[PDB]
Design a protein around this ligand. Sequence first.
Ligand SMILES: [Ca+2]
Length: 223
Amino acid sequence: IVGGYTCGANTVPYQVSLNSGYHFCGGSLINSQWVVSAAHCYKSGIQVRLGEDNINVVEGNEQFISASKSIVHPSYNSNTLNNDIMLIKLKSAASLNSRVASISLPTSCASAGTQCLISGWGNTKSSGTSYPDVLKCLKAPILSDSSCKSAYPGQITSNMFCAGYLEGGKDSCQGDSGGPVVCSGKLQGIVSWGSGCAQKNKPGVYTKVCNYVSWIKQTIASN
Ligand SMILES: [Ca+2]
């Protein structure tokens, strides 16, 4: 997260870190056994880390649970990043508490202009590299479909939306990938892609979760 703020320990209790020997992507806990992340975050040997603030210090509220299964969207296209969504099932149920909690799925898609909360342990610089230890947050508005399509001509599908600030300075970034965009209490986006980070006229692009609630529910009902 570029241009963001320190969230405060455990104030984003649905935020997970995916670890394969190191933090490599975010995710969102949607019930005690399931995490939503980005398909482009697929790797084998994932450990889900719940209840994290400082990802490099054991602070006492963590739950580390291995993935039992990963399910990339059937229509995920890594070339275009269309359908950039994946489910991760945990080997054991998380213990839900004040610091580890699920986030609601959407029933309807989010309004343009809605201020949403994006979070993660990704790069905090727009030029150069600095990865934070503690969880960073950013409040960012959903942009109009027209301004999103203008920004990335030919590349935006109905399964994507843009959010952020056209003037630059505030954005999600590498390492935040797979993490949540929460609007009005619902998981409406997943951190997916963008041209650089926090650059003028190049806003963040997010998976539009409300297009996937039927697949999410059917998959969790069968696995
Ligand atoms: Ca920790």
